[PDB]
Amino acid sequence: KRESGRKVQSGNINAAKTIADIIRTCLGPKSMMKMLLDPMGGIVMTNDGNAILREIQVQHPAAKSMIEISRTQDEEVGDGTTSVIILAGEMLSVAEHFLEQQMHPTVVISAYRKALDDMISTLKKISIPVDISDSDMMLNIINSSITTKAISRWSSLACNIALDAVKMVQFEENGRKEIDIKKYARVEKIPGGIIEDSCVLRGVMINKDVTHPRMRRYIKNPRIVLLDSSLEYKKGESQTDIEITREEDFTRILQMEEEYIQQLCEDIIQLKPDVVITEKGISDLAQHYLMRANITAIRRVRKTDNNRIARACGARIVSRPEELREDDVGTGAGLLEIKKIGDEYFTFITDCKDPKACTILLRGASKEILSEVERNLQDAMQVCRNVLLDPQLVPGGGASEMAVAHALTEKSKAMTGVEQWPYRAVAQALEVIPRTLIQNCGASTIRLLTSLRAKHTQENCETWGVNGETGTLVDMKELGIWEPLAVKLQTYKTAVETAVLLLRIDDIVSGH
Template sequence: MASLRQRLTIRIFSGSRPPRRRAMAPLARRERAAILVGSIPAWPGMVRAAMRRMPVIMEEETARFCQSRQSRCGAVWTAEHCFACHCTGMDTREPFRRHWIFVNVWPKSVVDVENEVQMKEIVNSCIGTKFSNRWNDKMVEMALQAVLTVARSKTPGSGTKSGQTMEVDIKRYAKVEKIPGGEIADSVVLKGVMFNKDTTHSKMRRRIENPRILLLDCPLEYKKGESQTNVEITNTDDWNTMLRMEEEYVENMCMEIIAFQPDIVITEKGVSDLAQHYLAKANITAFRRLRKTDNNRIARATGATIVSRTDEIQESDIGNGCGLFHMDKIGDEWFCFLDECKDPKACTIVLRGGSKDVLNEIERNLHDAMEVVRNVVYDPKLLPGGGATEMAVAMGIRRAGLKVEGVQQRPFLAVGEAMEVIPRTLAQNCGVSVIRTVTQLRAKHAAAYDEWEKNSKESGVVPPASDFGINGTTGVLVSMEELGIWEPFSVKVQTIKTAIESACMILRIDDIVSGSKKSQR
């Protein structure tokens, strides 16, 4: 069970700053502090109260505390670094002094993102109360399919955090197209890209199997000068010469494209009438003025490379990953589909609905579901919901505070109280007795903590913590694993980061200077 354990580290910085104004002297005499809590949720109001009561933690006591503990990995917690646990130790540099507490919680084992049943349970707990709960299965299936299509392995040097092997960018590569009409059940996730464009010429093909796709970032028309130019024409031959030069320029660009025999040409700029003629004559379908974002998604889905000049086209720039190209008319508009891609790393989600308001609401619900899947794929670890994680952390912090004497217990108790805000709020929303429910939940986690301390000291084996939480419907204490209520681990991390950073920012304010504009008489 040791592999299921996740250490959560609470960093507590304390220090003092001289007052800038006489009015700030009482606050400066107390120790100004900042608490940085890693991977556990807290709320700014309670944390600020804890910060104001934070005493000075002496360096000698910190070093003695760290060196007196043995880590589970067999290394000694020193004042510098534990390389086996990847925990940074004490930093005695002024003006801050650092004190460490180690709290153990047990997240669910690493989630298998390929396990569709398990992933559906996770997402269902997120959108079960949304507007689209009637089509839960459809929304969950679409969210899973879209995120897993976009996800790809991390490339070296990509800048992602160590230990995270997946890159998931649903904002850029998973686009939602809302088309009024039809039913919500008609919504689908395409293994490719769809965009709202018609062909530039009416005689161009509208259905191609296994097309060769060329993407351009240049106009297929005569290049205009950068500055205004005046040309004086004295006879008809000069006029014909200029027209012939423009035609030859466009013809050369088209011949450079035709030499590679693409089936589809897509450019972000314009296509002249003459270029349309040459391309249609060569049986090539062309699209113009496509968005840059759509062009990037097509390149990622089909394996094509965007080219900036026609004379720089290479065979490797042609995309062969699309299985089927077809044009469909939905309502009064034509839509282009690049579907059945072999290994698409971009997708389009087509939403259908009776009205724009319904489509907007479905889009918001689908976005929430996709974010949940994205968080799990990005960091496949889960924690029990229903206030179980918060109560477990609160219990660990309180027990750690009992080992500290004097006023130094106050921040421990304050942060522990802040952790219980979530289970207390859940009980209050259910209409049950808040005091009785929270007390029972605290007792269950206390028993699990006692068992953990006993077993860890005797055999070094860490048993799973209590996963009991509050059922949001009935208010009864139940096992979150049996109920299937889980929360992504990365969400907890981001929650506490945001809360603590906000609290630290507020506490660093020494004074507020406000000014008002003088009223004009």
């Protein structure tokens, strides 16, 4: 029914620790696999940490908060999600100071919040800048996601696809350098071909099918008209349908239906465009006038899709077709191609101009390959987005967590009070990241982790991480595990904030 007292905070630990203990071995390139039993007897062997916790039914409420926060992390960054839950579970894994020591939660919460500002300032000291003009340096960065995949052969092509696409969407004049993949970077798939044939289309491609055989197949200078309203007989303010039981009245309603549709379509063809793009649907009587003009009929195009077309060919959005002016034209468009590609109808408005957006064309032999190439380029574009926002890299392979753990230990000597004990626990909680990398490789954990702490004490903390494949110690200047700083900052801010949120709840009450 409900829980109260120390059992809530002690229960929230076991709930968050149990969820974390599953994916502990899912981190790293050597990460172990898992087995899920379907209710019908099926088996899913996927090692992806996002798919595992998605199919697991969790009873405890705090266990749901661990999953919902990880799902939000996937939207912003498609990497490092597993590291968030491991750190969020390890920081809460030490219950000694929580209960046995009889310390008040706010005393411990103040320790994490002070340790959070120190973990952020340490990463900026050990970071390194990046030259975004050279595409060779961006190649080894993206290869982190490309490795152990089937696109490794086309990896050289996969880099140019994600790099040039994000650079177009990035608008640096505003000062915030905002990049939106879910709109301007929108991707569609093309059946047929091979992986090499995949290129980056400059423009906005529409998947609308060809309804009638009369359309413009190829145009040197396309003309595009953008208007929101649908082409139909004008109705009343309500949705009430028109019911006519008399034949004489049918001729009165049909004449009004043919007159208004022909009137709006007459003002559209006055400019003589090559296509008509409407936001809503298009009736059958309206398509009869569109096929007579020998122009392409396009409908069901959202607002964001229309905003990109207006900046591409120079179009203009008008509320009603009767108000269309000469300002709406498609002048400047490269070509218009309705030609069938891969047994599917495509539309190319592509041009020589950069309307803060583009379209990615995915070629492939089968739909199984298309699904593999798609998801592999998605996170690769997010890697390009995270680097262009903060062009700074931090050493990976566990070198970043150990470099911060050494700074927290040295600073705790000057801290005087009861908060020094939980403040040092954060330094030992960051060692779980290099620990799982060694355990998955098979090498001894205690022997290597002890010698690793001696390297950051003497040598520079920017190097000497942990090799995941081999298992020994290697510098990060000689290896490509360098990771973007924007990912590590979001990881530590989320791991600490989630651990604080669960400690603040001392009672679970059921009611509405």
